[PDB]
């Protein structure tokens, strides 16, 4: 899944297979350096698009004045009543209109979806 | 500790003129090159450019063994003057203005020659992908 | 002992040296150092909580700046010296980088004023003038025309058509020097009029295109 | 414009040298005068706007400049001349402007000149007629806007008009375009879409990796850091993966410069001429606003990386497309 | 010859080549009536041709609010292509970015070359006139200092805009000419920056010599660009919102000086325009120009 970078020349490594070893080895055209592939995964594709919007949003977003704030919904981690509510506004967010809440307390870094 | 307890005050002297120009040599942290390991270092103006405008070229253990090319800075004192402070036997600090800044970068390990032929070969590989319908 | 070779004694020593950023106004004051060259004294104070480095200006130089330390991590800094003779030596390796920034010693009016003082003169701008400066002048003759007229009287380009044999000898000398001589070059050589010179050239030579047109006179093979 | 821009345009002029004795001319201080009309006798009379309409006079102010002439005869002797207030031409003056006589005059003075205090002014007088310049809406220069068009073959196009203080007579536009995700060839689809970037004076679109190599940062990691600030997201790496595939071992900066030079609107038969043309086009025609000078090519690479980064965010859908209708975008 | 020729021709190009000459630049002033003369002097021309029927340029837009009068548009084959700027809205002359840049470098600005690529993600980018001069670790600290300096007017003119896109992680400051900025009253936690004491001083200009620039120097009113307006919260009525109620926001950054101010001179002459149909107001804007006076 992650890119592999050549230690010797800092260039991308392309996996190659040798029958005797039976282990995937990353190969560099520029240099002879080779290393085993623990992942052994050549390619990965996800059509799920299930990435959480909470990871995409950040704690600093709550500080914005324009965003509306609800005292009714408290922050679970620090028990702070004030919290900010906004739509996801992200790719593939048409299916879900779920509200996203970020704690307005500074440095709390707590984000939850309601 | 003892260093914190000790307080040292040293006079600073700036020479109006310096006989030898002071320049900065920079080595990449990732390269981790060691001055002690090098058998010798030779510094000359870059052959490809062939004065001060030409970048310094550093060869370590011969040009083939290692190549470093200095990167000239268009303005070194233009944003602010830079002064080199040197420890002295009296201990009074001496400040020297930096005439030029050079950053030395290691040459790519693979090296070799590309030229027009390499560009054509890469185009041919792209054409081979284009030729196949699938 | 070679100009091409770089001395590595400083690199082996790994002597500690400091790279310090100094403001241009402070640098100008430092450049005009008192006497032979003294700018003041530097006081170093170290405490468990923090380390403070400060420099005090000389009273004569004036007639305390805190230093902001900059991390050297992620870079390696060394000092190399180029002599007037081009001899190369290494002073040492920089251990710390610092910036001289005044704290609470400059007013907002100052520093902003200091930039104006550095500029010295405001940028030039269009200036409106009452009335109009005279645009009409009355010279008897143009200066360039008179300079040419004096030159024409002083020097006459060519002379008369005389001593054709002497001119022929000069043409032979040019032909000996080079197989083909440009007609304009020959006109500079001989004072014979271009038309008379062409007739003498025709007798001893034939103009040749050389495949580039622009026929150039050359001596006849016959 | 009259007080400062006219002076700046003459001040920002290269000296003209003709040679072999060389004569050098420099345009320095600009001098301006209150508008005057020349009679048949040749005696000047101050222009009056009401009178100008009656006689069909054009309201204009004389322009003067200081020219310094230095000539070298190749004998190591220089002759210096100081021409001052040399006539350049006449510039029409907008009514009620500080230069215009009507401004700075009391209402009683205006009544004597038969000029209404109520009249707004702000109109140039040409041939005794009233002409007022009309403001024109224009897209902002030195700004990056991303638009996705179905008609365009490229799925996403980003436009960055570039100029420094309108010094260039024609603004230069550089566009970074992401190819459509769908591929006619399955092999092309398997590698992925290629982000070819349009540049000024290029015969065909140049891939981002090739232009990045020409700027510098030959190492693949260096190109990647400008294109993506954070490598945490796999999908952005997958988008740039075909760009990495097209150029790998060919990291030579001069060869990349030759490749753009050969695929260019202007062709140089000698290899050095192609390199010179490619270097100059990258230095000035491409991203002039970031740096007029050759130095700061690394800053130009950072700005080019930002344009690619915005395109990657637009492909993700994380960043919404810019709107032409937005008034702030318009100038 | 060139300057005179271009103004008379109405085409903005050199005499030798008419290919690059612009269309509709410089038009004869209308002297039919005093109101028509003012309307002609303040005019905006769309880059798109009148023949083009594309809906998006012709259609009125949300960002146009406070910068143009919707009622004052000429009817014809092209609709909304010609617009008149709002009376409050002022086109910015523009200022050099070099003095602001000196403040920015002093105020914790880090150059791109020294900064690592990872650091660029960590610290919000700063663009001045669309140029990536530097990045700042804290967006709010730089923004607060810039805005307070703008009220003083010592370093930055009120016309200059300071957009703060925290979500985009970019800070944009524009001193370029051609921006349109409208003065807006600044609102604090529950009160207008403007006070009754300022109004009484303004009423007597005989000795006080109070001026609009004096209010700008006070910082009670600040010019806001359309891009800044996107990041600026606005209050439709100051007294009602300031009084405790279920307001949309209690921290509006700015307040409109007046709703009627957005309307153009042709729109203002019509009585009770809101009661009248919106197309009828547009028709009267054309009638006012051709009215005989
Ligand atoms: Zn490798
Ligand atoms: Zn919390």
């Amino acid at each position: 899944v992650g890119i592999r970078f050549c230690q010797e020349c800092n260039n991308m490594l392309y996996p190659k297979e040798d029958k005797e070893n039976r282990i995937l080895l990353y190969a560099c055209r520029n240099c002879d350096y080779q290393q085993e592939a623990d992942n052994s995964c050549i390619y990965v594709n996800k059509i799920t698009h299930e990435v959480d919007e909470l990871t995409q949003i950040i704690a600093d977003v709550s500080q914005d004045p324009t965003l509306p704030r609800t005292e009714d919904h408290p922050c679970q981690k620090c028990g702070h009543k004030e919290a900010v509510f906004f739509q996801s506004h992200s790719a593939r967010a048409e299916d879900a209109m779920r509200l996203y809440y970020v704690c307005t307390a500074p440095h709390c870094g707590h984000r939850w979806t309601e | 500790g003892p260093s914190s307890q000790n307080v040292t005050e040293y006079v600073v002297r700036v020479p109006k003129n310096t006989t030898k120009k002071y320049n900065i040599m920079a080595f990449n942290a990732a390269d981790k090159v060691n001055f002690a390991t090098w058998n010798q270092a030779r510094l000359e103006r870059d052959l490809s450019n062939k004065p001060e405008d030409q970048p310094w070229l550093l060869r370590v253990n011969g040009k083939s063994g290692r190549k470093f090319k200095g990167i000239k800075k268009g303005g070194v004192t233009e944003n602010t003057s830079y002064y080199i402070f040197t420890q002295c036997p009296d201990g009074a600090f001496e400040a020297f203005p930096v005439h030029n800044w050079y950053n030395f970068t290691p040459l790519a390990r693979h090296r070799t020659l590309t030229a027009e032929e390499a560009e054509e070969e890469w185009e041919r590989r792209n054409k081979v992908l284009n030729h196949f319908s699938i | 002992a070679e100009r091409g070779e770089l001395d590595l004694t400083g690199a082996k020593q790994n002597t500690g040296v400091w790279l310090v950023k100094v403001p241009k106004y402070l640098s100008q004051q430092w450049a005009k150092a008192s006497g032979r060259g003294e700018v003041g004294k530097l006081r170093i104070a170290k405490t468990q909580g923090r380390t403070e480095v400060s420099f005090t200006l000389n009273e004569d130089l004036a007639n305390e700046h805190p230093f902001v330390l900059q991390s050297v991590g992620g870079q390696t800094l060394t000092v190399f010296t180029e002599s007037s003779s081009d001899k190369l030596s290494l002073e040492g390796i920089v251990v710390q980088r610092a910036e001289c920034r005044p704290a609470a010693s400059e007013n907002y009016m100052r520093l902003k004023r200091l930039q104006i003082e550095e500029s010295s003169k405001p940028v030039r701008l269009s200036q409106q003038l009452d009335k109009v400066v005279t645009t009409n002048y009355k010279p008897v003759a143009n200066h360039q025309y008179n300079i040419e007229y004096e030159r024409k009287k002083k020097e006459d380009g060519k002379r008369a058509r005389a001593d054709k044999q002497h001119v022929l000898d000069m043409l032979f000398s040019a032909f000996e020097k080079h197989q083909y001589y440009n007609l304009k070059d020959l006109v500079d050589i001989t004072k014979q009029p271009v038309v008379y010179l062409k007739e003498i050239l025709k007798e001893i030579g034939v103009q040749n295109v050389k495949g580039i047109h622009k026929n150039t006179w050359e001596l006849k093979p016959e | 414009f009259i007080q400062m821009s006219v002076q700046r345009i003459v001040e920002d002029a290269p000296p003209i040298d003709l040679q072999p004795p060389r004569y050098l001319l420099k345009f320095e201080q600009i001098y301006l005068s209150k508008p005057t009309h020349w009679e048949r006798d040749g005696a000047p009379s101050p222009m009056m706007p009401n009178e100008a309409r009656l006689r069909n006079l054009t309201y204009s102010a004389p322009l003067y400049v200081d020219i310094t002439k230095t000539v070298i005869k190749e004998g190591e002797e220089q002759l210096q001349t100081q021409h001052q207030k040399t006539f350049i031409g006449k510039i029409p003056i907008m009514l009620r402007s500080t230069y215009c006589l009507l401004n700075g005059l009391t209402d009683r003075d205006l009544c004597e000149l038969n000029e209404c205090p109520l009249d707004p002014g702000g109109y140039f007088i040409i041939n005794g007629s009233e002409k007022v310049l009309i403001a024109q809406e224009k897209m902002a220069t030195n700004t990056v806007y991303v638009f996705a068009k179905k008609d365009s073959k490229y799925a996403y196009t980003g436009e960055c008009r570039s100029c420094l203080e309108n010094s260039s007579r024609p603004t230069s536009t550089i566009w970074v375009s992401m190819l459509a995700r769908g591929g006619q060839g399955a092999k092309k689809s398997a590698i992925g879409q290629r982000i070819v970037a349009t540049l000024p004076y290029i015969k065909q679109e140049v891939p981002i990796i090739i232009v990045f190599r020409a700027l510098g940062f030959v190492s693949d990691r260096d190109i990647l850091e400008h294109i993506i600030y954070d490598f945490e997201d796999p999908e952005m790496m997958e988008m740039v993966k075909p760009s990495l595939d097209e150029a790998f071992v060919i990291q030579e900066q001069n060869v990349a410069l030759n490749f753009i030079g050969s695929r260019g609107a202007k062709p140089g038969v000698t290899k050095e001429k192609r390199i010179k043309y490619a270097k100059e086009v990258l230095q000035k025609e491409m991203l002039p606003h970031v740096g007029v000078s050759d130095f700061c090519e690394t800053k130009k690479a950072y700005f080019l990386g930002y344009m690619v980064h915005r395109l990657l965010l637009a492909a993700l859908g994380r960043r919404e497309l810019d709107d032409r209708d937005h008034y702030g975008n318009k100038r | 010859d060139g300057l005179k020729y271009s103004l008379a021709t109405g085409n903005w190009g050199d005499q030798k080549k008419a290919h690059q000459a612009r269309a509709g630049v410089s038009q004869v002033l209308n002297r039919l009536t005093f109101a028509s003369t003012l309307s002609h002097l303040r005019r905006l021309n769309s880059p798109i041709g009148r023949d083009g029927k594309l809906a998006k340029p012709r259609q009125l837009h949300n960002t146009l609010w406070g910068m143009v009068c919707p009622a004052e548009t000429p009817e014809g084959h092209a609709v909304g292509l010609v617009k008149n700027l709002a009376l409050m809205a002022y086109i910015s002359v523009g200022s050099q970015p070099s003095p602001i840049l000196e403040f920015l470098e002093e105020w914790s600005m880090e150059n791109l070359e020294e900064i690592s690529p990872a650091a660029i993600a960590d610290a919000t980018k700063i663009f001045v006139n669309g140029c990536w001069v530097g990045i700042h670790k804290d967006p709010e600290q730089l923004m607060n200092t810039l805005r307070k300096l703008r009220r003083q007017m010592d370093i930055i003119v009120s016309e200059v805009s300071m957009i703060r896109d925290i979500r985009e992680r970019e800070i944009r400051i524009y001193t370029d000419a051609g921006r349109i900025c409208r003065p807006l009253l600044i609102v604090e936690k529950q009160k207008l920056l403007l006070k009754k004491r300022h109004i009484d001083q303004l009423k007597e200009r005989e000795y006080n010599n109070y001026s609009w620039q004096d209010l700008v120097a006070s910082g009670v009113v600040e010019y806001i660009d359309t891009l800044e307006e996107e990041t600026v919260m606005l209050a439709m009525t100051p007294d009602d919102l300031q009084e405790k109620e279920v307001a949309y926001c209690s921290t509006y950054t700015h307040c409109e000086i007046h709703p009627s101010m957005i309307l153009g001179v042709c729109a203002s002459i019509i009585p009770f325009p809101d009661h009248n149909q919106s197309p009828r107001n547009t028709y009267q804007s054309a009638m006012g120009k051709q009215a005989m006076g």
Side-chain angles (χ1 to χ4, degrees):
Chain A
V1 38
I3 207 183
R4 228 57 61 182
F5 257 112
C6 185
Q7 300 173 358
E8 201 262 4
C9 75
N10 297 357
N11 281 20
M12 180 168 45
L13 287 156
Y14 314 96
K16 68 138 291 182
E17 185 58 46
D18 38 317
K19 271 64 63 186
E20 330 92 8
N21 91 330
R22 277 294 86 182
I23 303 291
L24 246 184
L25 290 182
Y26 283 107
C28 187
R29 305 305 169 270
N30 296 95
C31 68
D32 296 353
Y33 152 76
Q34 306 281 138
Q35 91 270 20
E36 68 96 19
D38 55 344
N39 57 323
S40 99
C41 169
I42 286 232
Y43 173 65
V44 42
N45 195 7
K46 297 294 298 301
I47 333 281
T48 59
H49 209 279
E50 55 190 357
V51 43
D52 198 3
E53 281 70 30
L54 283 177
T55 72
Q56 312 165 12
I57 67 185
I58 0 179
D60 50 16
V61 175
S62 69
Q63 306 165 357
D64 218 10
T66 166
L67 281 183
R69 295 173 169 87
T70 23
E71 198 82 26
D72 302 348
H73 304 267
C75 159
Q76 294 82 20
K77 195 161 67 61
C78 76
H80 180 48
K81 302 178 182 59
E82 185 67 284
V84 323
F85 68 100
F86 54 92
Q87 279 282 345
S88 41
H89 65 257
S90 74
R92 216 223 61 176
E94 70 280 327
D95 42 24
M97 285 190 69
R98 278 285 295 269
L99 222 37
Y100 280 82
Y101 286 73
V102 180
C103 184
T104 195
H107 307 103
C108 189
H110 187 63
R111 305 185 297 265
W112 68 102
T113 170
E114 284 168 338
Chain B
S3 304
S4 300
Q5 296 161 3
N6 193 16
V7 169
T8 54
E9 185 163 17
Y10 292 118
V11 156
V12 173
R13 292 184 299 261
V14 174
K16 302 181 180 179
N17 187 28
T18 170
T19 60
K20 40 169 51 185
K21 300 174 301 179
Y22 273 68
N23 302 316
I24 293 297
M25 174 171 289
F27 286 116
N28 186 20
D31 199 14
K32 297 173 185 302
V33 264
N34 186 21
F35 324 103
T37 62
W38 313 328
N39 187 32
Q40 58 166 3
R42 290 194 42 87
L43 192 57
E44 267 173 4
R45 293 304 179 172
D46 189 22
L47 195 56
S48 305
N49 287 65
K50 208 170 305 299
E52 193 68 35
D53 301 354
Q54 297 187 16
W56 276 114
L57 188 70
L58 182 62
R59 300 145 295 178
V60 156
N61 306 1
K63 186 180 302 177
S64 304
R66 172 72 83 180
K67 183 177 303 179
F68 282 113
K69 190 174 303 180
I71 304 300
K72 191 194 175 186
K73 201 177 190 302
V76 195
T77 64
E78 294 183 5
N79 293 162
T80 24
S81 180
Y82 284 105
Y83 284 96
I84 292 294
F85 281 66
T86 57
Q87 187 64 34
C88 296
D90 60 348
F93 299 138
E94 208 169 2
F96 303 97
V98 174
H99 172 259
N100 211 350
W101 189 296
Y102 286 92
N103 302 273
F104 288 79
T105 55
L107 199 63
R109 303 192 182 179
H110 40 265
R111 287 189 179 187
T112 75
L113 295 171
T114 45
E116 264 286 343
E117 306 174 1
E119 316 173 8
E120 305 155 4
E121 294 157 7
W122 286 103
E123 294 162 7
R124 293 157 195 174
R125 290 169 257 190
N126 303 344
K127 293 162 192 172
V128 162
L129 299 162
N130 299 338
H131 296 326
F132 298 137
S133 60
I134 306 174
Chain C
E2 184 193 2
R3 159 239 176 94
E5 161 260 341
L6 163 71
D7 185 32
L8 292 176
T9 302
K12 310 292 292 191
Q13 283 170 348
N14 206 352
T15 307
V17 284
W18 303 284
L19 179 53
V20 174
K21 165 183 297 180
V22 167
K24 185 165 295 182
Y25 53 89
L26 198 55
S27 299
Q28 293 296 139
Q29 195 185 359
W30 284 22
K32 308 304 173 182
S34 305
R36 160 212 170 269
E38 192 257 0
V39 292
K41 47 192 182 178
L42 194 139
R43 189 199 74 256
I44 322 174
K46 301 173 186 178
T47 91
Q48 286 77 23
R50 69 236 62 91
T51 290
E52 175 206 358
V53 179
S54 65
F55 171 78
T56 308
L57 289 174
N58 186 25
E59 180 185 0
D60 195 20
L61 197 83
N63 298 348
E64 182 178 349
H65 311 282
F67 281 57
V68 187
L69 298 182
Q70 311 293 137
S71 176
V72 284
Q75 205 182 195
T76 301
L77 295 175
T78 100
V79 185
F80 86 98
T81 67
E82 181 187 3
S83 303
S84 304
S85 64
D86 294 352
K87 178 56 194 171
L88 296 163
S89 182
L90 221 137
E91 266 290 337
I93 284 88
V94 169
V95 282
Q96 178 66 221
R97 188 167 188 175
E99 296 183 0
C100 293
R101 302 290 188 176
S105 47
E106 48 99 2
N107 194 12
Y108 231 68
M109 307 310 182
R110 292 196 295 267
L111 185 68
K112 178 189 181 184
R113 69 172 61 172
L114 259 53
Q115 297 148 359
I116 307 175
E117 297 161 11
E118 172 263 345
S119 305
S120 301
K121 50 93 54 187
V123 51
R124 297 180 292 188
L125 73 143
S126 306
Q127 317 168 13
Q128 195 162 24
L129 309 169
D130 198 21
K131 199 52 198 306
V132 270
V133 306
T134 78
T135 58
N136 294 345
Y137 311 104
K138 341 278 157 182
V140 181
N142 267 188
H143 188 53
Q144 34 97 2
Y145 196 95
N146 69 55
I147 293 181
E148 166 61 26
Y149 198 87
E150 172 267 343
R151 182 223 60 90
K152 182 177 181 174
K153 294 306 192 63
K154 171 202 59 183
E155 190 268 342
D156 200 30
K158 298 282 116 229
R159 253 109 227 107
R161 2 169 67 108
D163 293 358
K164 164 187 262 174
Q165 178 65 220
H166 176 268
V167 175
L168 181 69
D169 299 343
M170 292 195 289
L171 290 180
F172 281 140
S173 304
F175 278 147
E176 188 89 9
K177 220 285 295 298
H178 205 91
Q179 163 73 29
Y180 51 93
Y181 239 86
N182 185 26
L183 173 62
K184 294 183 285 297
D185 300 356
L186 294 164
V187 169
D188 186 33
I189 295 168
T190 91
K191 252 67 181 291
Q192 215 83 312
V194 198
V195 269
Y196 208 59
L197 176 66
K198 177 182 182 178
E199 309 307 310
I200 317 173
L201 275 169
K202 219 170 305 182
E203 176 200 358
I204 59 167
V206 49
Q207 72 285 334
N208 193 7
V209 268
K210 307 286 181 180
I212 60 177
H213 303 90
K214 200 200 59 180
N215 300 56
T216 297
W217 288 91
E218 66 160 357
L219 56 109
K220 288 171 178 177
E222 175 182 353
Chain D
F1 143 80
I2 192 69
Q3 207 173 7
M4 272 288 188
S5 178
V6 166
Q7 170 88 37
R8 293 196 190 103
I9 291 177
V10 319
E11 268 181 337
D12 305 347
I16 41 194
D17 317 330
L18 274 315
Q19 59 173 352
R22 320 180 312 183
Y23 290 66
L24 334 164
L25 298 178
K26 188 178 304 300
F27 285 68
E28 300 184 355
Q29 190 74 75
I30 277 271
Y31 286 94
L32 256 148
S33 161
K34 305 178 172 298
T36 44
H37 156 76
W38 304 88
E39 298 171 345
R40 288 185 151 183
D41 59 357
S45 301
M47 297 209 57
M48 298 306 170
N50 193 36
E51 268 69 22
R53 304 186 191 96
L54 300 175
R55 308 183 49 180
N56 293 8
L57 306 174
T58 303
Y59 201 82
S60 53
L63 183 61
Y64 305 107
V65 75
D66 290 2
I67 305 187
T68 58
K69 172 187 168 184
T70 39
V71 33
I72 165 183
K73 48 191 297 180
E74 262 69 10
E76 282 74 48
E77 299 297 321
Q78 277 265 13
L79 171 67
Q80 82 93 18
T81 333
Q82 288 286 333
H83 277 81
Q84 62 166 0
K85 287 93 168 176
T86 72
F87 200 89
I88 294 200
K90 276 182 176 296
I91 304 188
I93 301 292
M94 175 180 290
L95 231 61
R96 293 297 160 95
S97 292
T98 56
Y99 276 68
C100 181
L101 301 186
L102 292 191
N103 206 16
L105 283 189
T106 82
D107 295 354
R108 304 199 71 256
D109 302 349
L110 293 175
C111 293
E112 307 307 311
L113 299 177
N114 301 353
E115 286 290 319
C116 199
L118 292 175
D119 175 67
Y123 49 89
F124 300 90
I125 298 189
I126 297 99
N127 298 351
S129 76
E130 304 181 343
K131 266 286 185 174
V132 34
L133 240 168
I134 305 297
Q136 301 279 159
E137 314 172 17
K138 182 197 58 180
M139 201 61 69
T141 64
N142 308 353
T143 35
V144 190
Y145 8 81
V146 181
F147 315 113
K149 296 149 294 182
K150 41 166 186 55
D151 53 289
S152 71
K153 65 188 72 58
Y154 320 107
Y156 290 94
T157 310
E159 176 180 25
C160 180
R161 315 180 187 269
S162 37
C163 63
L164 45 135
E165 288 88 25
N166 293 151
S167 299
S168 189
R169 188 196 322 171
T171 61
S172 60
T173 64
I174 156 214
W175 315 316
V176 175
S177 57
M178 179 175 302
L179 199 56
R181 182 56 245 180
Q184 185 67 33
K187 280 306 184 302
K188 317 185 319 181
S189 178
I191 76 178
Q193 22 81 28
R194 303 175 299 105
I195 321 178
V196 271
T198 99
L199 304 167
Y201 293 98
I202 67 171
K203 176 183 55 187
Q204 39 180 333
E205 276 72 31
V206 171
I208 46 170
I209 302 292
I210 309 293
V211 56
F212 264 105
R213 295 248 173 88
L215 288 150
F217 297 101
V218 303
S219 175
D220 302 344
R221 198 85 192 94
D222 300 351
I223 307 181
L224 250 262
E225 56 94 352
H226 292 106
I227 294 180
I228 351 190
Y229 310 121
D230 195 11
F231 313 98
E232 227 71 24
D233 182 44
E235 282 66 39
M236 280 189 289
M237 300 194 304
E238 295 160 14
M239 291 168 182
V240 81
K241 205 164 301 299
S243 300
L244 290 170
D245 299 340
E246 67 196 345
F248 188 52
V249 323
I250 177 187
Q251 294 188 3
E252 218 276 271
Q253 177 166 350
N254 299 357
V255 169
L257 207 59
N258 184 35
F259 191 71
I260 79 182
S262 58
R263 304 156 60 255
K266 307 301 299 176
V269 275
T270 85
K271 226 279 296 193
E272 46 97 3
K273 279 306 179 300
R274 252 173 301 174
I275 292 295
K276 183 185 308 180
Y277 144 79
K279 184 182 307 177
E280 77 200 6
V281 82
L282 201 68
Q283 164 192 351
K284 309 164 305 179
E285 278 76 13
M286 205 277 301
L287 246 39
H289 77 289
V290 171
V292 45
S293 176
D294 205 4
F295 272 97
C296 99
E297 286 289 317
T298 154
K299 296 216 312 178
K300 232 103 56 175
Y302 276 106
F303 206 86
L304 186 62
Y306 178 63
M307 214 169 314
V308 186
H309 193 79
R310 289 172 56 94
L311 217 62
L312 296 178
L313 290 174
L316 287 164
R318 201 176 303 175
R319 267 205 64 256
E320 291 83 19
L321 300 166
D322 298 26
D323 186 24
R324 317 189 179 178
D325 299 350
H326 197 289
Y327 217 37
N329 296 19
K330 299 297 298 177
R331 287 283 186 268
Chain E
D1 188 27
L3 300 172
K4 186 183 309 188
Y5 163 85
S6 63
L7 279 153
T9 307
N11 285 162
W12 239 234
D14 289 15
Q15 191 157 353
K16 251 61 181 180
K17 72 281 181 304
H19 328 296
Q20 293 109 223
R22 199 171 354 187
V25 256
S26 184
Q27 292 176 7
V28 275
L29 184 56
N30 302 350
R31 261 314 220 267
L32 192 42
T33 187
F34 187 64
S36 184
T37 301
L38 305 175
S39 182
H40 195 275
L41 281 159
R42 302 159 51 96
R43 190 146 291 179
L44 304 166
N45 254 352
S46 69
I48 184 61
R50 314 297 191 265
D51 279 4
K53 61 185 60 60
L54 199 47
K56 49 123 177 174
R58 296 204 186 181
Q59 269 173 340
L60 184 66
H61 191 237
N62 307 68
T63 67
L64 263 298
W65 160 273
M67 303 295 186
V68 128
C69 172
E72 201 171 354
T73 172
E75 308 94 73
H77 45 93
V79 163
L81 286 203
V82 175
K83 294 173 304 183
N84 292 50
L85 56 136
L87 292 171
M88 259 304 160
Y90 150 87
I91 331 283
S92 65
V93 284
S95 64
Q96 291 288 145
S98 307
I100 115 184
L101 240 303
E102 295 162 355
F103 161 72
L104 290 178
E105 60 89 13
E106 172 193 4
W107 207 259
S108 307
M109 198 187 69
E110 292 88 26
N111 189 33
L112 296 177
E113 280 65 49
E114 47 175 3
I115 274 305
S116 70
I120 295 178
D122 303 344
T124 48
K125 320 159 188 169
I126 314 170
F127 297 92
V128 178
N129 293 358
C131 301
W132 203 1
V133 282
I135 69 169
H136 202 294
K137 32 85 182 172
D138 204 6
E140 48 104 351
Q141 181 63 40
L142 181 68
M143 186 54 57
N144 192 23
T145 323
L146 281 160
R147 287 181 177 178
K148 78 184 59 179
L149 280 178
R150 200 169 69 186
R151 322 284 164 91
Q152 305 167 24
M153 207 93 154
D154 299 351
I155 302 196
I156 18 199
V157 193
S158 280
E159 309 168 6
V160 320
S161 53
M162 256 93 67
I163 329 152
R164 190 193 162 186
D165 300 344
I166 26 91
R167 184 220 62 90
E168 204 168 346
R169 273 196 171 267
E170 67 159 5
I171 308 172
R172 285 194 176 266
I173 313 173
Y174 281 92
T175 72
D176 54 348
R179 291 176 294 102
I180 179 167
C181 308
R182 59 203 193 98
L184 290 172
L185 328 146
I186 312 199
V187 189
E188 29 107 321
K189 307 297 169 297
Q190 57 123 1
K191 287 191 178 293
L192 271 175
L193 268 210
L194 196 45
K195 309 295 186 180
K196 183 185 301 182
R197 46 186 177 94
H198 296 281
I199 312 296
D200 61 60
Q201 296 151 183
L202 191 49
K203 295 168 188 171
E204 320 139 359
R205 298 170 80 180
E206 307 297 306
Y207 358 91
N208 306 338
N209 301 158
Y210 229 78
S211 74
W212 182 252
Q213 285 303 312
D214 301 350
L215 269 88
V216 176
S218 183
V220 294
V221 276
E222 216 174 20
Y223 286 71
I224 301 295
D225 186 35
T226 324
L227 288 168
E228 202 178 16
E229 184 185 357
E230 131 194 347
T231 53
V232 146
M233 207 65 189
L234 256 154
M236 200 69 254
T237 154
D239 296 358
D240 301 351
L241 293 166
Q242 285 159 13
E243 289 297 327
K244 187 187 57 56
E245 67 172 8
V246 49
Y248 266 119
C249 195
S250 187
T251 57
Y252 301 110
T253 59
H254 284 87
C255 176
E256 304 275 334
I257 314 195
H258 205 264
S260 177
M261 268 298 104
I262 77 180
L263 297 178
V265 293
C266 289
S268 79
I269 68 182
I270 314 161
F272 312 109
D274 58 332
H275 300 272
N276 300 316
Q277 209 190 357
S278 177
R280 285 301 171 172
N281 302 331
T282 298
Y283 302 146
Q284 224 279 329
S285 82
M287 300 176 198
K289 305 174 189 181
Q290 66 143 151
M292 285 174 52

